[PDB]
Design a binder for this molecule. Structure first.
Ligand SMILES: [Zn+2]
Ligand SMILES: [Zn+2]
Length: 80
């Protein structure tokens, strides 16, 4: 599963840094990035845009394969 980690800091790697940065992170649904601990890990679906921290959703362990949320894993659950 795709897991992105981010750490908060008063003055970290920002305000230019290398005068060239291009990246687009995900947006958790359980929280509005207002209080997710100093370091958190977001999770994006492999067939969807379900972006939720594994701590926010309550995921016991992070699979070492594809991540299909209940909506998609259910869509293909019946089919074959
Ligand atoms: Zn969250
Ligand atoms: Zn999904």
């Amino acid at each position: 599963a795709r897991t992105k980690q981010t750490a908060r800091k008063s003055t970290g790697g920002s305000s230019g840094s290398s005068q060239s940065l291009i990246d687009e992170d995900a947006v958790c649904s359980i929280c509005m990035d207002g209080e997710s601990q100093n370091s958190n890990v977001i999770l994006f679906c492999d067939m969807c845009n379900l972006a939720v921290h594994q701590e926010c959703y309550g995921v016991p362990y992070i699979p070492e394969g594809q991540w299909l949320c209940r909506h998609c894993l259910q869509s293909r659950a019946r089919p074959a």
